[PDB]
Amino acid sequence: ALGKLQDVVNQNAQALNTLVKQLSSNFGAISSVLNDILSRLDKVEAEVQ
Amino acid sequence: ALGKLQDVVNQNAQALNTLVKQLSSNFGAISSVLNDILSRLDKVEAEVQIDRLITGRLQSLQTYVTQQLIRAAEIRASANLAATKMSECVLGQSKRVDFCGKGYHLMSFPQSAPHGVVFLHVTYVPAQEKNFTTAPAICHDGKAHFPREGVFVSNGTHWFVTQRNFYEPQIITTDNTFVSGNCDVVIGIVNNTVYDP
Amino acid sequence: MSLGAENSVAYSNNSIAIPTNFTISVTTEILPVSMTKTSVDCTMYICGDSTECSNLLLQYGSFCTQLNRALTGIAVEQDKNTQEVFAQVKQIYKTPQIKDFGGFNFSQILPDPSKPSKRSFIEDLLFNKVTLADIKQYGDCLGDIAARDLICAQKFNGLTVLPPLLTDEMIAQYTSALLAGTITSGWTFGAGAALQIPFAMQMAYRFNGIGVTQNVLYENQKLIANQFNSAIGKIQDSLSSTASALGKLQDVVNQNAQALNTLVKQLSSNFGAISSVLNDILSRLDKVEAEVQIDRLITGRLQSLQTYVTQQLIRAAEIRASANLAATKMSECVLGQSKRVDFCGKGYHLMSFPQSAPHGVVFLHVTYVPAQEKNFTTAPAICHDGKAHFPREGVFVSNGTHWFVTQRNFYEPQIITTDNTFVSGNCDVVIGIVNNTVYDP
Amino acid sequence: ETKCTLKSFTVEKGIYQTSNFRVQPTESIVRFPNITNLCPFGEVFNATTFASVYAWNRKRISNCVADYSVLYNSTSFSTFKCYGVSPTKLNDLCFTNVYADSFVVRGDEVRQIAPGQTGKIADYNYKLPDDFTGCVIAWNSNNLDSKVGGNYNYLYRLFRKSNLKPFERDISTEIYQAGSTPCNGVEGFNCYFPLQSYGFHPTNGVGYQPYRVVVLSFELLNAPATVCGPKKSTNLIKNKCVNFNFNGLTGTGVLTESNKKFLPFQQFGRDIADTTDAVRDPQTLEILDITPCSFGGVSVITPGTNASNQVAVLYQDVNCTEVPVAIHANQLTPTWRVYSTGSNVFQTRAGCLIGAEHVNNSYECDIPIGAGICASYQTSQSIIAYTMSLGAENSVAYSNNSIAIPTNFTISVTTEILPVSMTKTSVDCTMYICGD
Ligand SMILES: *[C@@H]1O[C@H](CO)[C@@H](O[C@@H]2O[C@H](CO)[C@@H](O)[C@H](O)[C@H]2NC(C)=O)[C@H](O)[C@H]1NC(C)=O
Ligand SMILES: *[C@@H]1O[C@H](CO)[C@@H](O[C@@H]2O[C@H](CO)[C@@H](O)[C@H](O)[C@H]2NC(C)=O)[C@H](O)[C@H]1NC(C)=O
Ligand SMILES: *[C@@H]1O[C@H](CO)[C@@H](O[C@@H]2O[C@H](CO)[C@@H](O)[C@H](O)[C@H]2NC(C)=O)[C@H](O)[C@H]1NC(C)=O
Ligand SMILES: *[C@@H]1O[C@H](CO)[C@@H](O[C@@H]2O[C@H](CO)[C@@H](O)[C@H](O)[C@H]2NC(C)=O)[C@H](O)[C@H]1NC(C)=O
Ligand SMILES: *[C@@H]1O[C@H](CO)[C@@H](O[C@@H]2O[C@H](CO)[C@@H](O)[C@H](O)[C@H]2NC(C)=O)[C@H](O)[C@H]1NC(C)=O
Ligand SMILES: *[C@@H]1O[C@H](CO)[C@@H](O[C@@H]2O[C@H](CO)[C@@H](O)[C@H](O)[C@H]2NC(C)=O)[C@H](O)[C@H]1NC(C)=O
Ligand SMILES: *[C@@H]1O[C@H](CO)[C@@H](O[C@@H]2O[C@H](CO)[C@@H](O)[C@H](O)[C@H]2NC(C)=O)[C@H](O)[C@H]1NC(C)=O
Ligand SMILES: *[C@@H]1O[C@H](CO)[C@@H](O[C@@H]2O[C@H](CO)[C@@H](O)[C@H](O)[C@H]2NC(C)=O)[C@H](O)[C@H]1NC(C)=O
Ligand SMILES: CCCCC/C=C/C/C=C/CCCCCCCC(=O)O
Ligand SMILES: CCCCC/C=C/C/C=C/CCCCCCCC(=O)O
Ligand SMILES: *[C@@H]1O[C@H](CO)[C@@H](O)[C@H](O)[C@H]1NC(C)=O
Ligand SMILES: *[C@@H]1O[C@H](CO)[C@@H](O)[C@H](O)[C@H]1NC(C)=O
Ligand SMILES: *[C@@H]1O[C@H](CO)[C@@H](O)[C@H](O)[C@H]1NC(C)=O
Ligand SMILES: *[C@@H]1O[C@H](CO)[C@@H](O)[C@H](O)[C@H]1NC(C)=O
Ligand SMILES: *[C@@H]1O[C@H](CO)[C@@H](O)[C@H](O)[C@H]1NC(C)=O
Ligand SMILES: *[C@@H]1O[C@H](CO)[C@@H](O)[C@H](O)[C@H]1NC(C)=O
Ligand SMILES: *[C@@H]1O[C@H](CO)[C@@H](O)[C@H](O)[C@H]1NC(C)=O
Ligand SMILES: *[C@@H]1O[C@H](CO)[C@@H](O)[C@H](O)[C@H]1NC(C)=O
């Protein structure tokens, strides 16, 4: 019993977890880390990334 | 009739068709065909074109999913209303006004339909009304008499007591009325006689 | 925070509390019905008077049709909400000429013919209590201004507001017809042809519905009419003084205006381009290495339009749910009497009266509240001749010496006769039976 | 037009909203300022001597016309690049503050005059900003800056403590301490003079030959222009859908006389949505305002195309007397012009309806126009507009001693249709996006 409250809690936790883990996507860039882009490229031709 | 089921079907078909036909968009790329991009360009300076196409198609899919969820919420609300009506009007009799048809509800019958349900409501409608002269109470022996159920009516000469939803006049006896107080505070009381068995 | 006032009730196994008086209480309920209908010209919002931007936007063709289809569906749903909320009956019942209603005074809710718009006093107060920030005719924006009003900005950026199908006079006529039907015919006009009845007999029907014998009305008619008139006047002076009410209609209007203003002011974003102005890009760069900037601007503005449309759909669903609730309350409380608890006000429901409001409806619920209770000693049954007696309706009470039978909601003691009780079994199984005598006529 | 908005050849009965498809601009005007002096390209491209790269020369250029077609006969440029502006748009623009930086560098170091470069010249002599706008010009000058025996009058800095800032100049000649021991202001071991001289012989390689470099820096600031392009002004056209060019700013719309005060050293005045509306005419000093040429708020009311082809047009929030000015009916086709005026003209609270006659009757709403007005197709055949009827007028005979009692009844059945479920769909994203 109490499946409805349980899966509401599970849905909220899963949404937060996938929002956290969606930070590892390149989105068509050279890397998913801002530090690598800021460390390997200058002020120009890094704004696109 | 049956416009709701028809346009739900039409909405779903139109959404699928426009999702199919949205594949012919460049999204700012040189072409809308992946084969031309992969045939005219090398591995580098072709990832940007494929990235534009991927972003556009992902946006289209997300828009379709969002509209599907929004439609599903309304469909679920309609299904909840249909389940409530089936429970409260097929499995019983409802006193709620206009919940299951115009007039006073008597019965209901369910029928199936493509992605839907059809309720046949059987109700009672009064007709052929007649004018009458009424009174709140009757003072017979210095005391007021109020009807148990129904009202006092008069055809010009005599007085009768009748039920409210149908005309069925009866002699005003002590088994139809009850006594409460004297005939001094009720506004519009009428002198008459009350039969005693 | 404090939950409320601490209270306790004196409970024993042989005690009752019976009310001896009553009050007639009227309450107000405000429900939104519809909202503003908007239309968006996508090719004018994204590419204002630019042919190259139009040619580039020709690739994104079906998105504009999809957005316009969604907005038109929202608009026709907004009209339909008012259609099933207010157009319940299809007969425009004229107001009666004579106003002999047994002492009841419906002057503040009936229409006033002196005003150009046939509206009541309460309806005028309700319209004056909502700002309804708009009427800007085209041409006034043309010249003598730099569009500080932001309506000219919305019009020049391709955002328009469509007027509703039913004007305020027709809604006022519908409410007047419902009010004339419900005070001259009772609930009969909502289930067929309207049958006339005096108002006192109608209120006797309502009192019999809530469980009180109808002689209470015929003995306290003047007091009930005075209480009803005083409470109507109290609602009138409460609404004529403070503006803290009608918050729902006000913040629906505020939400729509804020959404439109945000959509207008989102045009000043670069979206990762060299500038947010199409003219600078078209005047500083040639045909190539300018399609990328216009493509970025097109993608950003299309995203903004899609976000606005999605939020509008989400708001429209909630507005439709509220309109469905309002239609249900209209059909179940104005056209009849409801036995559901707290569906149409605190207490026992007697009547309801509708009034119009900007994108909404206001219900005045007339209810019955008992008051001035008293303690009594109570028995479940009476054993007279070796057999138990149970009341047909009401309960047995005792004032210390003698026993009486009374109705449950009002104090009206009577002699325990054989016409008030019925006999079932011997006085051996009922727990707490009390010896007494049952009179026989 | 409403066939074109729906992208179909058949139209169902009802009301539709259409996009703008009527008015097209035809005329174009230019409003450049009147400057007559030719710009002194020669005084900077034909000087008898230039400056060293470590002491590059900066000159301000103002109140001139940049034609640059007079340089086609004299000099040919080996390097010509531009950042922030396309080269073909240079004749249509007016600048604000033009700065020319001139020097002479080796032919192998011309590639270092660019943003983001590194090396010897870009680190210690001359550095460009990352957000640089303007152009770089460089050409060979072996027959001018080189002579027999060696030209040693050009110098460059070889050593420095740190890299230069953008547009920074350093002419100090202090002794550079390469090692750890102090130099004490005298040359020696690990103590070098920071400047060194180019050896420009007329017989060395192409990469070791003198090149002359001129860097032009500009900006499109909101200020009166001083340097313009070679364009001729055009007379003002008002109250028409025209293209305009004001001091290099291009646009489209309708020009109308207006008024506003404006601060002198500013030029452009924007709107809430960053749209330019306030300008100063450089030839007449009259501030006009720009209005969009497109108009929105046109709806088409029609029956089905299977029925007929007649339509009615509703203009939203437009007075029925001001309709042809608001839609520019003078420059439209006559088939659109017949819907601008005529006899069937009705003024409603929703606007102006043209093409349907206004009857005095009242029926049920067939096609909802708005504000209590509906329209329908009735009888020849025509399109009529009316005010919708709420219902049948009725009255009830009320008195204080009268009641009405029913004497008969009817049993009535009725339908109620309710949707329950819909179509269940699934997608395959890796097949939809990237098929095989
Ligand atoms: C009102 O109703 C009463 C009862 O039905 C009528 O009285 C009867 O009238 C009939 C004639 O139609 C006589 O034959 C009966 O003998 C009457 N009964 C009694 C007890 O007197 C009366 O006529 C009706 N009045 C009107 C005006 O219709
Ligand atoms: C109803 O009947 C009562 C008699 O029971 C009437 O009361 C009498 O009326 C006469 C004439 O006005 C007086 O002289 C008597 O003194 C009254 N007696 C009492 C006890 O009140 C009464 O008037 C009748 N009402 C109507 C409307 O006819
Ligand atoms: C029931 O309550 C009403 C309302 O409070 C009482 O009516 C009041 O009676 C007093 C004294 O008779 C008057 O001064 C007030 O003006 C009355 N109020 C109104 C609104 O008319 C009534 O007396 C109460 N009844 C009982 C039995 O207690
Ligand atoms: C109904 O209540 C009102 C409020 O006290 C009574 O007073 C009238 O109020 C209206 C305001 O809408 C005025 O225009 C009238 O002039 C007022 N009349 C008087 C006599 O002051 C009104 O009289 C009551 N209705 C009845 C039938 O008594
Ligand atoms: C309980 O109620 C009964 C009935 O009202 C009371 O009996 C009457 O009391 C009065 C005095 O207040 C006498 O004048 C009557 O003659 C009594 N009637 C009978 C039939 O005896 C009784 O007094 C009440 N008891 C209490 C404790 O208040
Ligand atoms: C209620 O009255 C009955 C009389 O009908 C009482 O019953 C009698 O009580 C006496 C005294 O205890 C006994 O001697 C008799 O045998 C009983 N008769 C019967 C038929 O039961 C009864 O006790 C009374 N109850 C109360 C609570 O007073
Ligand atoms: C601008 O001048 C300052 C002051 O001399 C320079 O900062 C010095 O740089 C040297 C070389 O690294 C250091 O040894 C000093 O300690 C610095 N002094 C201070 C106060 O910071 C600075 O390098 C010069 N700017 C450039 C671009 O060369
Ligand atoms: C109540 O209404 C029904 C329905 O109209 C009436 O029944 C009709 O009576 C007439 C005359 O006797 C017949 O010709 C019809 O065929 C009947 N219709 C049906 C469906 O049976 C009935 O007579 C009415 N009753 C009263 C008292 O007026
Ligand atoms: C005295 C300089 C005045 C500068 C004023 C503003 C500059 C705008 C025009 C720049 C053009 C410079 C000449 C470039 C010629 C290129 C032709 C070629 O490829 O051969
Ligand atoms: C033997 C190579 C070891 C170094 C490998 C690590 C890479 C870092 C150095 C790369 C630059 C090499 C010299 C280029 C000098 C600048 C060019 C110029 O004159 O403008
Ligand atoms: C009742 O009487 C009134 C007034 O004479 C009349 O208008 C009405 O039609 C009558 N009702 C019936 C059902 O005859
Ligand atoms: C009904 O109204 C009439 C006229 O106003 C009046 O003469 C009569 O006394 C009233 N009757 C009642 C019971 O109120
Ligand atoms: C009933 O009696 C209890 C206990 O004496 C008391 O607390 C309560 O107030 C009484 N009720 C009334 C209405 O006085
Ligand atoms: C009520 O409770 C009291 C308290 O114990 C008890 O003495 C009495 O018998 C009870 N009466 C009934 C009818 O239960
Ligand atoms: C450039 O300078 C030389 C030398 O003074 C001169 O002969 C020539 O005419 C000049 N050319 C131009 C275009 O000024
Ligand atoms: C300039 O043009 C003239 C003829 O137009 C030509 O004789 C002359 O040689 C040109 N100048 C140079 C430096 O070639
Ligand atoms: C030329 O420039 C002057 C200087 O501001 C200005 O007053 C004038 O209007 C301009 N145009 C003409 C045609 O003289
Ligand atoms: C435009 O129409 C309105 C009616 O809504 C009218 O009041 C106004 O005077 C009209 N304008 C002109 C210039 O006639």
Burial of D215 (0-12, 13-18, 19+ CB in 10 A): buried
CA torsion, ordered B20, B21, B24, B25, to nearest 10 deg: -100
Pick from C18, C28, C58, C20: nearest CA to C42: C58
Closest ligand to residue D70's CA:
15
Angle at D19 between CA D13 and CA D20, to 5 degrees: 130
- Give contacts of C89 with chain D, Cβ < 8 Å: 391
> Whose alpha carbon is nearest atom 10 of ligand 17?
D283
- Does the Cβ of D405 fall within 6 Å of ligand 11? no
**B28, C295: Cβ pair inside 8 Å?**
yes
Ligand 10: which atom is nearest the Cα of residue D112? Answer: 20
**D291, C277: Cβ pair inside 8 Å?**
no
The answer to whether D396 contacts chain B (CB < 8 Å) is: no
- Give contacts of D116 with chain A, Cβ < 8 Å: 42, 44-45
**B185, C306: Cβ pair inside 8 Å?**
no
Report residue A48 as tokens: 């696109």
- Residue C334 DSSP class: I
Main-chain phi, psi angles of D348, to 5 degrees = -115, 170
**Break-preceding residues in chain D (C–N over 2.5 Å):** 379
Interface test with C, best of D23, D268, D395, D414 (most C CBs within 10 A): D395
- Does the Cβ of D36 fall within 6 Å of ligand 17? no
Residue with tokens 């290495």: C289
* Integer Cα distance of B179 and B142 in angstroms: 10
Return the axis-axis angle of helices C291-329 and C247-265, rounded to nearest 10°.
170
Q: Which residues of C383-415 are buried (b: 16+ CB within 10 A; e: fewer)?
A: bbeeebbebeebbbbbeeeebbbbbebbbbbee
* Integer Cα distance of C186 and C351 in angstroms: 10
Burial of C416 (0-12, 13-18, 19+ CB in 10 A): buried
Strand partners, D385: D358, D375
**CA distance, residue B63 to nearest chain A CA (Å):** 18
Report residue D298 as tokens: 């046109």
Radius of gyration for chain A, computed over Cα atoms and rounded to the nearest angstrom: 18
| CA nearest to B72 within chain D | D422
Radius of gyration for chain C, computed over Cα atoms and rounded to the nearest angstrom: 32
- Give contacts of B125 with chain D, Cβ < 8 Å: 409-412
**B18, C62: Cβ pair inside 8 Å?**
yes
CB nearest to C332's CB, from B97, B104, B144: B97
> Which regions of C51-143 does DSSP assign to beta strands (E)?
91-93
The answer to whether B48 contacts chain A (CB < 8 Å) is: yes
* Integer Cα distance of C173 and C169 in angstroms: 6
The answer to whether B75 contacts chain D (CB < 8 Å) is: yes
- Which residues of B, range 9-38, sit inside 8 Å of D by Cβ? 9, 12, 16, 23, 34
H/E element, C386: none
Q: Which resolution in angstroms does this entry have? A: 2.9
Number of neighbouring beta carbons within 10 Å of residue D153: 14
CA torsion, ordered C45, C50, C56, C58, to nearest 10 deg: 60
Residue by residue, DSSP assigns chain B as --HHHHHHHHHHHHHHHHHHHGGG--TTSS-S-HHHHHHHS-STTSHHHHHHHHHHHHHHHHHHHHHHHHHHHHHHHHHHHHHHHIIIIISS---STTSSSSSEEEEEEEEEETTEEEEEEEEEEEEEEEEEEEES-EESSSEEEEESSSEEEE-SS-EEEE-SSS---B--BTTTEEEEEETTSSTT-EE---B--
- Give contacts of C166 with chain D, Cβ < 8 Å: 372
Lining ligand 10 with CB less than 6 A are D 112, 118-120
* Integer Cα distance of B193 and B142 in angstroms: 11
CA torsion, ordered D138, D142, D145, D147, to nearest 10 deg: 170
Residue of D34, D36, D286 best suited for mutating to test ligand 17, as the one with most atoms within 8 Å of CB: D34
Report residue C111 as tokens: 């229409």
**D414, B101: Cβ pair inside 8 Å?**
yes
How many CB pairs below 8 Å do chains B and C form together? Answer: 93
- Give contacts of A44 with chain D, Cβ < 8 Å: 115-116, 130-131
SS3 D185: coil
Interface test with B, best of C72, C101, C215, C315 (most B CBs within 10 A): C215
The answer to whether D199 contacts chain A (CB < 8 Å) is: no
Interface test with A, best of D130, D131, D133 (most A CBs within 10 A): D130
SS3 C124: helix
- Does the Cβ of C402 fall within 6 Å of ligand 5? yes
- Give contacts of D391 with chain C, Cβ < 8 Å: 89-92, 177
Contact between residue C427 and residue C433 where contact means Cβ atoms under 8 Å apart? yes
Amino acid in the structure at residue D132: F
* Integer Cα distance of D77 and D65 in angstroms: 20
> Whose alpha carbon is nearest atom 15 of ligand 7?
D161
| CA nearest to B51 within chain A | A28
Strand partners, B143: B182
How many CB pairs below 8 Å do chains A and B form together? Answer: 5
Contact between residue D107 and residue D140 where contact means Cβ atoms under 8 Å apart? yes
Interface test with B, best of D6, D8, D403 (most B CBs within 10 A): D403
> Which regions of D332-401 does DSSP assign to beta strands (E)?
345-348, 351-354, 357-358, 367-370, 373-378, 382-387, 392-394
Query: How far does the centroid of ligand 15 lie from the alpha carbon of residue D92, in Å?
Result: 28
- Give contacts of B58 with chain A, Cβ < 8 Å: none
**C215, B99: Cβ pair inside 8 Å?**
no
Report residue B90 as tokens: 């097929």
- Does the Cβ of B142 fall within 6 Å of ligand 1? no
Task: Give the Å distances, CA to CA, from C161 to C137, C155, D181, D285.
Answer: 12, 9, 81, 38
Strand partners, B46: none
SS3 D336: helix
Residue of D61, D68, D94 best suited for mutating to test ligand 9, as the one with most atoms within 8 Å of CB: D68
Total residue length of chain C: 441
Radius of gyration for chain D, computed over Cα atoms and rounded to the nearest angstrom: 38
Phi/psi region, residue C33 (left: phi>0; alpha: psi -120 to 50; beta: rest), is alpha
The answer to whether D433 contacts chain A (CB < 8 Å) is: no
Contact between residue C133 and residue C256 where contact means Cβ atoms under 8 Å apart? no
Query: How far does the centroid of ligand 11 lie from the alpha carbon of residue B129, in Å?
Result: 10
> Whose alpha carbon is nearest atom 3 of ligand 11?
D397
Number of neighbouring beta carbons within 10 Å of residue D287: 17
**C218, B186: Cβ pair inside 8 Å?**
yes
The answer to whether D431 contacts chain B (CB < 8 Å) is: no
Non-local (6+) Cβ contacts of D363 within 8 A are D374, D376, D386, D388, D389
**C338, B96: Cβ pair inside 8 Å?**
yes
| CA nearest to B55 within chain A | A27
Ligand 15: which atom is nearest the Cα of residue D46? Answer: 1
Neighbouring chains of D at 3+ CB pairs under 8 Å are A, B, C
